[PDB]
Amino acid sequence: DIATLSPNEQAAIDAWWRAANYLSVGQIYLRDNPLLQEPLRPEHIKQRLLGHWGSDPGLSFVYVHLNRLIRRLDLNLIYVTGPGHGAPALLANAWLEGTYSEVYPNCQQSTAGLQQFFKQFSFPGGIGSHCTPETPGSIHEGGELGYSLSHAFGAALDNPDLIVACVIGDGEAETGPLATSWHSNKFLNPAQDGAVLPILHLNGYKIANPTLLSRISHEELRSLFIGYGYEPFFVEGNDPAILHGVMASTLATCVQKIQAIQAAARSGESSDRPMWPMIVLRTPKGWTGPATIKGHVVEGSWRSHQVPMADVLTNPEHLQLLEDWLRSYRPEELFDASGAPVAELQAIAPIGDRRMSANPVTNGGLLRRALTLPDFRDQAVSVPAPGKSRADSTRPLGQFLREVIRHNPDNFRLFGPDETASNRLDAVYEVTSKVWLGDRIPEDEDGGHLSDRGRVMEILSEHTLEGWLEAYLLTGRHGFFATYEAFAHVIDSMVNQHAKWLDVSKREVDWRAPVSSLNILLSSTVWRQDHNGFSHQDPGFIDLVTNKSARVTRIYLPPDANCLLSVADHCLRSTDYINVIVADKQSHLQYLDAEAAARHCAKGIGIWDWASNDQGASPDVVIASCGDVVTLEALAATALLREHFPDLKIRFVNVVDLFRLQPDTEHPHGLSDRDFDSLFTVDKPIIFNFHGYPWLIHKLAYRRHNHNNLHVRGYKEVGNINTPLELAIRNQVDRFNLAIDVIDRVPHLRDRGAHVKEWLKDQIHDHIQYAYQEGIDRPEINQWQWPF
Amino acid sequence: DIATLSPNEQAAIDAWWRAANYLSVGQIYLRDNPLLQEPLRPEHIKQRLLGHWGSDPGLSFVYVHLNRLIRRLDLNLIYVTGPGHGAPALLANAWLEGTYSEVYPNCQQSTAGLQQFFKQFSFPGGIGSHCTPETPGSIHEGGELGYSLSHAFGAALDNPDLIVACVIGDGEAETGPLATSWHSNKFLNPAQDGAVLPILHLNGYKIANPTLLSRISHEELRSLFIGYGYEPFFVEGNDPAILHGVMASTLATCVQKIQAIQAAARSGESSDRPMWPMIVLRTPKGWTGPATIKGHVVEGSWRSHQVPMADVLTNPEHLQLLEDWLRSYRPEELFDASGAPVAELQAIAPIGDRRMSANPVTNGGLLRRALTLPDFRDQAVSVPAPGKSRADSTRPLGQFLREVIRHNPDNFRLFGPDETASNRLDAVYEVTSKVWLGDRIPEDEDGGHLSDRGRVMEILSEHTLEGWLEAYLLTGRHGFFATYEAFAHVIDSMVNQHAKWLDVSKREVDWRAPVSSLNILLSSTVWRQDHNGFSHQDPGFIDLVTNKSARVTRIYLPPDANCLLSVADHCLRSTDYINVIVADKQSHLQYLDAEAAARHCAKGIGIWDWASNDQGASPDVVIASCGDVVTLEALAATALLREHFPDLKIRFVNVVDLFRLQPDTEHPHGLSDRDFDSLFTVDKPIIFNFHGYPWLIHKLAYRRHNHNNLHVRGYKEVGNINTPLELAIRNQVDRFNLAIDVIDRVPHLRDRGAHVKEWLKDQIHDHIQYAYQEGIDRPEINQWQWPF
Ligand SMILES: Cc1ncc(C[n+]2csc(CCOP(=O)(O)OP(=O)(O)O)c2C)c(N)n1
Ligand SMILES: Cc1ncc(C[n+]2csc(CCOP(=O)(O)OP(=O)(O)O)c2C)c(N)n1
Ligand SMILES: [Mg+2]
Ligand SMILES: [Mg+2]
Hints:
This is part of a larger assembly, with two copies of chain A (788 residues).
Chain A: H1 7-29, H2 56-73, E1 80-81, H3 87-97, H4 99-103, H5 111-120, H6 148-155, E2 163-169, H7 170-173, H8 176-181, H9 184-187, E3 195-201, H10 218-227, E4 230-235, H11 240-267, E5 276-281, H12 316-327, H13 331-334, H14 343-348, H15 364-367, E6 390-391, H16 394-407, E7 412-416, E8 434-435, H17 442-447, E9 450-451, E10 456-458, H18 462-474, E11 478-484, H19 492-507, E12 518-523, H20 541-547, E13 553-556, H21 561-571, E14 578-582, E15 588-589, H22 594-603, E16 605-607, E17 621-625, H23 629-644, E18 650-655, H24 673-679, E19 686-689, H25 695-700, E20 710-713, H26 724-730, H27 735-745, H28 754-774, H29 779-782
Parallel strand pairs in A: 1-2, 2-3, 3-5, 4-5, 7-10, 7-11, 8-9, 11-12, 12-14, 13-14, 17-18, 17-19, 19-20
Antiparallel strand pairs in A: 6-15, 16-18
The structure holds thiamine diphosphate (TPP) (2 copies) and magnesium ion (2 copies).
PDB class: cytosolic protein
Keywords: Carbon metabolism, TPP-dependent enzyme, cytosolic protein
Entry title: Cryo-EM structure of cyanobacteria phosphoketolase in dodecameric assembly
């Protein structure tokens, strides 16, 4: 009898649904007089109205039904919100359940607390309109549309008993990130993971246009959602008496299929991809609000979004209509004299930790356990001489990630857009394979590593790929993202959303516990110009990350394999940061030992003693490199200068942590003025060789005393197709161009070095001519190693 | 008998198909000996192999069939390429048709030209691997995957007889932008536009993973593409004798339905959305290449993508296998002694302008006609006194765009993410409405402006929306894009792709004719904090545009309505630039007359004489503003300083064109050093008030002499919910914060202005306290106007 509902409990469900809508309008409009004891007056209304109403009836409608289902079956839900502007619906339900009062004691369940609850919403010094981190039981901000469904799957990536209900707006569903995210049901594993129940709020209207998915036929819509792999269920109408029975029946129908699918998967009798249940709602937008106000339809139309009436203070007629709107819910029976909800509402509310707004999964920092990782020195390569031994840097990282997977079989996952095999990370394929959960052929078995059980996710859409990871970290787990640098502009919008969440959670919100860090690995940098990716790769993703504050994002550019392992080991321990690691796939030199890499990453920036020419004397020039390809050119430039100018004294500085360049005033993590002056001399010129746009270094080191003597060579532009050496010539980061620049800046080499500067220009022209004749660099260029 | 094919012509089609694959492998591998007259030797092979082979057989297979269909029905095709790495297939067909020889006389149809044709591909000083602007008959760069289908629809937005064939890779269909772009059939109007025939290359494998759409069932795949609204047709197998007959039959089936749909729409008897034809190909990836090389399957698998064999020079066995691969096409019969294609291939090639690689639509600059622009002074607002009259700035722009629509009914369109009504641009709705081509209700008629015929497209997904515009401009037409600034990070990847195309077309390619400019309008800036959008809006889109060269992007920030019209009028005339216009939706002051706005936009940056305090004397401080909200604060700061310091001399400078700040050496458009020193004094401090990140101004004006005296206030961070005045206080761009800053920088006000600086801090505290109690700014703040 779960599908059917008793008539008596339907009134209590409707009473909860009315109370949620009453509180929703109250915080949108009312500033004082919460219970309408006295007649409404303009001083009780907020001056500026930024709340959103269009999604509020739908979210409150689903939420109360879920509380009914969570009482009987003793489930656990999260309720990630799609539209994101339906926060009044969530906060009203959180207040009714008592969760909001416990989190915020000021908003007590009383008449005075109700006045404070309405006052704080959409107000200066108060909670925001969207689903902010201050909102209890929320992981998805929802301000940017299209990432809600991916966050639903990410929260259930390793929780078997968890159930996630994601409400999808029809205006949101046409977005590119949400169009692909439906296919994520295939990669979800029913045996070891929870079930996500998507709900489509097909209200029919956007802010100003009819929705695309409501203006298609019912047959075409059913065809479309069958192709996505979901079992479609349709709930239509606008009569609450009909809608309560139908929607409760459909919810009971879907959850039993969800339990049937999970039980069949864990039993192993049905090892195949099932069509997951899904619910479609055709309820009109704002169907519990005013119908017609100014001669136009305000219910079930685009006019129902965020504004029932434009002006209330100016026009007393609208205020009278507003007062009648609040009276339509009959608030007198819903609340007592004290202002608390009546005993009918208290009984039907979930009790204890089972409350969806109080689920520990949403506040994943409490659920988070520290990652158990082995020592990286076991997987580090051995270097007898720095700069003379050549080995690929991807293999040590792949082995290290494999060891973490075995030691952390549940709370760790790896994400890659078909570049895990490309980036030579096949070491993790030894123990675990990628998860596909589809039809397989024996040709696939020999070729690709695919299985139903796996810890590596695979999809080309980086939108849904990063959406899985962001929710995975906010749930309390740990993850790692590896991709090309060329396609990092795709996730540009999503990173800013996640950086916004961490910034508010760390500072403004006090009850939010810290979650794991966001580790993004960028491979195949713009300098090598690999076969994949467009010809004009852009390293501009590093710049937009630096636009975010240094207290939420960290950028690391390790030169070699050992320094890559130390960065990867250190970043897996951090909590409230976004870690961007830029390493190159191609085989390179190795400069640091396993022990020396740890010391280097501890400081972040340090002098390389073997590369440095003279110690105990003031250097004539400071040569600095940041990336790994440009580090080789910086080292090769040092070899040429030391060969042709024996008396020249060169200090070599390598920077791994970019934000160390920022002064100590900007952030405590940055180097102090005395520390910076020790590394880079106060007066001698600095020849910085930066991977990426050369101006980014000037932004960080602007406040430094020696900024005027800082010279940066970096990425400027790329030709259609170029050799690795001649691409550096175009951007003037080649070994010869750096050596030319050092001659110019050093005061006593501008006259002595004229012959050498002429010789270097001959080498530039000679190598370019050989590149045009043969198409490949000279053998002594590719096989270069540190002379001394 | 169009569906069936004669056996004799099938051999000629196969002969063309073999020749295309032979030329495809030749340019990938061979550097010399194009016709294999002598046995193959390693010096004939390219040293580094950056070509991709996996998509090449499929593209050549479709192209030769299309040439068959274009001969009989006398159609016109474009063949936008999805994978983008199938450029060898395109260039081979272009060379065979003779188009490439005409465009590039060096690559003549001869043995010597064949040697040059193979040599130039994937080589320094040669054509790139992807389909670049150098490729004849190409509009889509194809390096980024997911934007191909949108470019197919955009090229046919106003060409009625044009037919566009877009080949879609199955791996590309995993991308978010491609998943949404299927629904673009609904926005396409069959009556006045051409038909786009999408082809799905469902080969089953990506570079390293099986494709998602091949691992779904045939029934679910058919359900998915029915929901998109397309008529699905399936072509499967790997036998050329079978595949030639089936694929030619399906093409003839689809084109007649395309002609039936277009004829029915133009007759008006069938005014409904039809199911467009679509073709699905299950051919294995690289099914004409080697099968097994190193004990693994290299045909119809992920190994077929990119290069089939890793080493050729090192291993002579692979070179022998490579030689056998070239012999499998039997090149001796395909070419004569001179190296030209035989008379069998010449006869079946399209003749004249009908060649798809030589279609004038692809080189849209030739097709482009100058826009007929009505004088904007008719729609400009009237201002008797600058800074005292308040009027909304969106309405004059909407009227101006309406007039352009009537005067240019065919080659002009508007694009918005259902924000045109939000942007108060309903003036264009008077004459033309939005295009929907779906079911409609009388409620929609009163509320929304929807009709089958329209010039404004409105879909929320900016990926497909911006993709429509890019192809529209490359076709030779004109357009205008309007959207919010908060969601400009969505089109971040797409803008860099378009700027790459224009930069190469401007300099490297000489036969490319100039096309229309890309005009993007950004509204609802971060300062107003409208109801829509997330609370933490980011103006970072301005910064990433500036990362690209100043010779391809222009950024305009007009302060008022008249300056907005002059910018919009001027940018509709420009050709090879990306124009980003940042104006604010909210009602503001007006500072410039219709005539004075034209003079202001002519210079780009100019002194405002009425705002300037003293003329004929050296100013004590230069106050500069860039945006429109920050311009009001800069003006209000000037009013306070002139009120409290009568002796103070203030010069007010407003900048509209951002790149004018760059020195003349960086670009000829930038101001000279003497011009910059006239505007901004060489020694007096400059208080710059910039909309967006404050460091962008330092990047542009870094090389200036007076850069050290430049002080920029701009966007730093935004709270959860703030009033417009309080948000400026936190970012220190408020009128009081600017007035405080002027007191600090001016040497003779640091002592005299201590009392005034104390008074200003009281005003900051007072307004914040009023904001917290009331939630709205004081009435005199909102109704401020210029006193003098
Ligand atoms: C990509 C993008 N386009 C537009 C917006 C602006 N926006 C914010 S909320 C909203 C309404 C979405 O409508 P729908 O998904 O139907 O939700 P409903 O309110 O009807 O439940 C829009 C257009 C946005 N945030 N992101
Ligand atoms: C968004 C994105 N993800 C990944 C890549 C890298 N990439 C370039 S080509 C390619 C292969 C996918 O091509 P597919 O659509 O399978 O084409 P087909 O081989 O069938 O022609 C990949 C993954 C990219 N360019 N863009
Ligand atoms: Mg809607
Ligand atoms: Mg493929």
